[PDB]
Design a protein around this ligand. Structure first.
Ligand SMILES: [Mg+2]
Ligand SMILES: [Mg+2]
Ligand SMILES: [Mg+2]
Ligand SMILES: [Mg+2]
Ligand SMILES: [Mg+2]
Ligand SMILES: [Mg+2]
Ligand SMILES: [Mg+2]
Ligand SMILES: [Mg+2]
Ligand SMILES: [Mg+2]
Ligand SMILES: [Mg+2]
Lengths: 441, 118, 131
RNA sequence: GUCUCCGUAGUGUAGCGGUUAUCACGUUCGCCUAACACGCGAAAGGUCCUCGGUUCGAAACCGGGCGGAAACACCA
RNA sequence: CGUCGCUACUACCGAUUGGAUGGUUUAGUGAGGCCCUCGGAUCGGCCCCGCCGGGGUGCCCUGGCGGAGCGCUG
RNA sequence: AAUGAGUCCACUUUAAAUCCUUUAACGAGGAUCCAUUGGAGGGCAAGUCUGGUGCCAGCAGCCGCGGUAAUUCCAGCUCCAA
RNA sequence: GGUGACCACGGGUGACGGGGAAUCAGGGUUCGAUUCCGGAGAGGGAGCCUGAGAAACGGCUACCACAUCCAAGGAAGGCAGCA
RNA sequence: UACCUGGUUGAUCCUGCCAGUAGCAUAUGCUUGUCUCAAAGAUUAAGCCAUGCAUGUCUAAGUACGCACGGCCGGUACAGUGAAACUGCGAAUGGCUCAUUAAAUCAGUUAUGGUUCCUUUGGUCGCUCGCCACUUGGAUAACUGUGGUAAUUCUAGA
């Protein structure tokens, strides 16, 4: 045998991300019936009855009280073709950095779109998030995604054909601008709470025949969302490149110590091999490698693995660092790195000195413009002008950047997932940047 | 939880079970352990209720009284063979022992005889 | 859902009742009852499941000079349970909570009334036994 | 991770959607002294933590992110 | 040299029948084990003995059903 | 001219390894194949050297140094002890 | 009746005791948790079966303090052993 | 190696302490080419522990009708290899720590004519007048089969 991928579910708030993910987990042998019966017992006890499938991933007490998604969660469910672990995005603009962190460690994206009246239009607005999630997934480097359609039992009348056709058209007419091909991006109508068109073909909506995809690598056509989750093309794993681990979270488990959990990008992680961390620069030796309550003697790229390193505290290593092999070339503190920010939507002018928040891979630190070198048009790195005084929406630019809080970055030519990063300001998206040069200390 | 004879209640009680009482086997010698046992009185709150019929009824239960499986091995103590086959005093004891016949697909036919004692 | 039926009150203002949690307080002096409108010369009283405002009189020192929201979990007054059962506990007890309802403490000693457990799921989660 | 509060010359920090000011300083400073000590005079000094939104324009009206100060949770 | 005035530090007295954390115990309540005095849910031997049986010759060497002696007992 | 510190054949060793001792073959002229840690007023061995700061920064276990020509602060050179 | 200025009794010990270690004119002054001997203990007390030998804890029972699983009816604990 | 030096004064003798000096023994800082020995969670927490291991064991000489193998020499109780289990023994040694403990433990010395003692070794085992002895009785394991619980090194019935 089996291969490993990562999948993020993205969409609008209150559309039922955790619910549909948890019921997909339940359909795929996630947990026994009596534990989830206890879960529904709890949900009926305090009141959030329809929020019962959300509890499989929304384990935090604040989420369990407010009924609002906060943290990225992992759960394992084995499918017909191959193993998959799922990323559950928060879907809130207060937690946009959390969504960015979660989407970073995901090979595929699931764009769940609400079909009920009001929610769909509220998602597509300047206050919306469906634009934000897809744009920053395109920015952070996710090629193939799927757009799912949810809540066919809430719309009036339920299970409508014209509704779904409008949904597909209105998703396509802007995702073409974003960058995903609807001929390759599958479109599925589903309903997690009812549990239709997910594991078996639907009977309440016979109007849906089946999605079709037309990719260069492979052509597929199915009826259920498992049949679309399994036809996802296997990503090219660059295992020869030096090992890099963009860290998700840090845990201090009693008896085994502080065990980092991070996505394997390149190389192979193994027990008994000294590793280093770029931001904290403390050496440590790996004891063992495991994933999802199972062990590994080898860790393959694109994997959420938990490996026990020796003699580092929980406070010393925090969220969002970069780890690597100590024998090969290490990730090292980047005093400055030359980035190619492509300005998308910024009202004011961008001169050297304004500080947006720049999110290389996982973590989130605001960085500052030093000076703007050249103005570049919208593709191919074609040279236009030298040293513009200010930057405005609709233009790419090459810039030298000096972060304030220390961080390490890597270029897009050596480790392509590390090269992808976004720029955020004014509580919106302001630029798309890639790293092509970097200076170490 | 199995039932123990003599508890004289319907319900579960805890007993410090010693060697050879019931519902307990000691891990090491002299060890006693408190265990939860169910009372001897039977009521609705049971999963299984072992029954042994004493005297034969008028007819045969299907699958129960028919196809009487023999006991596997015969007596080993010499006086027990004497009592089984009505031996007076040393009358062909060596040849009155039950010779067990056993075979397999790759096994050439062979009988088995125990080492009779006493 | 379901709304709690009326029960015998038995615990007026000024009643000091036991502390049933692990907060460190030892008793709760009831100073008022939440949701009581009133009547001339009538003392506000509380049954099980009722939010009360209470001040601890003995216990851990940094709790004594304050007013806390509290929920009565046991009472010594018999009350009918709409199934003909008259139930009374051995002692009057309560736990320290906040406005939202979750307990300040983490565990409860002894049983809790069925009505209080139904009306406060957070208390019922910590309940050792249900009476 | 959730929640509550605080942050404004270098400090003491008033504060008003139409004005970040004053004052005790701290310093520098002509001003004397061999040097002090002591007295005489002027000042400088603020992104209102920081960044945004509302607004004709807001430190302050609203919201985020950061630092502190209390909790509350947090077990592959 | 000492009071007085200002700035810091250290202890001291001090209402608050102050507070917190350990130890040792009074009394009360008292799980559990051990010992004794009972207790007998069950499991066994003898008198089996309604008898078919029986051999030195109803007078049984006993080979089984069966009641049960409705007792003696371990 | 001679050696190793290192690469490294085999042996040896060892439960099996490792290391050391043997032993092939490479392995030195800034033999750059680079010895450091604290000091130079006294006690207490070593500078009345040069340039900076100017009762500031600082040094100083202790006497004390420093307010514009610092044997004591920071640096450079040279010496001191291990 | 017994013990006490030949220091009883009580308190503190950052007290396990000793063989021993450090310093080294002589005399001493400090240190001994630590590989040998003896003692105590197995989270805190307590009570026990087996066995020649245990108040044993890599044996049992109860309470206490923590603490693992749960289908909430229950079940299982003791690294001052090597890691 | 039986040792001193600077500091109260305008200067001098003292008393006196402060500072200097040297060793080991913890921590720590800088540095580090080789080799031989070698301490190492004691000091605060005898605080809390996930996971794995740390106590098991068979001779000719206790009990083998497990086919789980096997020589049969073929008319035979048991050739033999041996699982599992019953039985016996060990598990009270070792290892770890120093909390408690101030005639307590402990050390040197003495006594048990005031006691016990598995095992090893050596004695004693025809010393007794008293219808199976050519060997008596019953049950239980292991084993077949039927299950209960979510469980456990849990067990029931036949
Ligand atoms: Mg025999
Ligand atoms: Mg009145
Ligand atoms: Mg100098
Ligand atoms: Mg001690
Ligand atoms: Mg010692
Ligand atoms: Mg010892
Ligand atoms: Mg002991
Ligand atoms: Mg014995
Ligand atoms: Mg004990
Ligand atoms: Mg060198």
């Amino acid at each position: 045998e089996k291969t490993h991928i990562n999948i993020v579910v993205i969409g609008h708030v209150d559309s039922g991300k955790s619910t549909t993910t948890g019921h997909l987990i339940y359909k795929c042998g996630g947990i026994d019936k009596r534990t989830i019966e206890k879960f529904e017992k709890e949900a009926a006890e305090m009141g959030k009855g329809s929020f019962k499938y959300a509890w499989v991933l929304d384990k935090l007490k604040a989420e369990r009280e407010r009924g609002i998604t906060i943290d990225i969660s992992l759960w394992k469910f084995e499918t017909s073709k191959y193993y998959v672990t799922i990323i559950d995005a928060p879907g809130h603009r207060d937690f946009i950095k959390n969504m960015i962190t979660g989407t970073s460690q995901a090979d595929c994206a699931v764009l769940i779109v609400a079909a009920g009246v009001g929610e769909f239009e509220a998602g597509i607005s300047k206050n919306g998030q469906t634009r934000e999630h897809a744009l920053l997934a395109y920015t952070l480097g996710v090629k193939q995604l799927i757009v799912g359609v949810n809540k066919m039992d809430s719309t009036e009348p339920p299970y409508s054909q014209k509704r779904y056709e409008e949904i597909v058209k209105e998703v396509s007419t802007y995702i073409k601008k974003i960058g995903y091909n609807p001929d390759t991006v599958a479109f599925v109508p589903i309903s997690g709470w009812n549990g239709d068109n997910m594991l078996e073909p639907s009977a309440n909506m016979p109007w849906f025949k089946g999605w079709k995809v037309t990719r260069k690598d492979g052509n597929a056509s199915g009826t259920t969302l498992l049949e679309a989750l399994d036809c996802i093309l296997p990503p090219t794993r660059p295992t020869d490149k030096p090992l890099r681990l963009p860290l998700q979270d840090v845990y201090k488990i009693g008896g085994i110590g502080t065990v980092p959990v991070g996505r394997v990008e390149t190389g192979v992680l193994k027990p008994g091999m000294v590793v280093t961390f770029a931001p904290v620069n403390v050496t440590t030796e790996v004891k063992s490698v495991e994933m999802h309550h199972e062990a590994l003697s080898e860790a393959l790229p694109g994997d959420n693995v938990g490996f026990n390193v020796k003699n580092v505290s929980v406070k010393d290593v925090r969220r969002g660092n970069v780890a690597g092999d100590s024998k090969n070339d290490p990730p090292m503190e980047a005093a400055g790195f030359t980035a190619q920010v492509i300005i998308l939507n910024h009202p004011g002018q961008i001169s050297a000195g304004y500080a947006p928040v720049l999110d290389c891979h996982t973590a989130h630190i605001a960085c500052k413009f030093a000076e703007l070198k050249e103005k570049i048009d919208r593709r191919s790195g074609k040279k236009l002008e030298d040293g513009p005084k200010f930057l405005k929406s609709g233009d790419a630019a090459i810039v030298d950047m000096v972060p304030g809080k220390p961080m390490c970055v890597e270029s897009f030519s050596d480790y392509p997932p590390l090269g992808r990063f976004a720029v955020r300001d004014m509580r919106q998206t302001v630029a798309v940047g890639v790293i092509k040069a970097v200076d170490k200390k | 939880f199995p039932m123990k004879q003599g508890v004289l209640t319907h319900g579960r009680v805890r007993l410090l079970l010693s060697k050879g009482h019931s519902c307990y086997r000691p891990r090491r010698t002299g060890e006693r352990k408190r265990k939860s046992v169910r009372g001897c009185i039977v009521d609705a709150n049971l999963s299984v209720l072992n029954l042994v019929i004493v005297k034969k009824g008028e007819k045969d239960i299907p699958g129960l009284t028919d196809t009487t499986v023999p006991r596997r091995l015969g007596p080993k103590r010499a006086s027990r063979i004497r009592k089984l086959f009505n031996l007076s005093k040393e009358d062909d004891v060596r040849q009155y022992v039950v010779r067990k016949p056993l075979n397999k697909e790759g096994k050439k036919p062979r009988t088995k005889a125990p080492k009779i004692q006493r | 859902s379901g709304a709690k039926f009326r029960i015998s009150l038995g615990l007026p203002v000024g009643a000091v009742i036991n502390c049933a949690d692990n907060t460190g307080a030892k008793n709760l002096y009831i100073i008022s009852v939440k949701g009581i409108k009133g009547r001339l010369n009538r003392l506000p009283a509380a049954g099980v499941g009722d939010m009360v405002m209470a001040t601890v009189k003995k216990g851990k020192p940094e709790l004594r000079k304050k007013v806390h929201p509290a929920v009565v979990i046991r009472q010594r007054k018999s009350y009918r349970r709409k199934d003909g059962v008259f139930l009374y506990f051995e002692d009057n007890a309560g736990v320290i909570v906040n406005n939202k309802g979750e307990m300040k403490g983490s565990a409860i000693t002894g049983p809790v009334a069925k009505e209080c457990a139904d009306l406060w799921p957070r208390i019922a989660s910590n309940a050792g036994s249900i009476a």
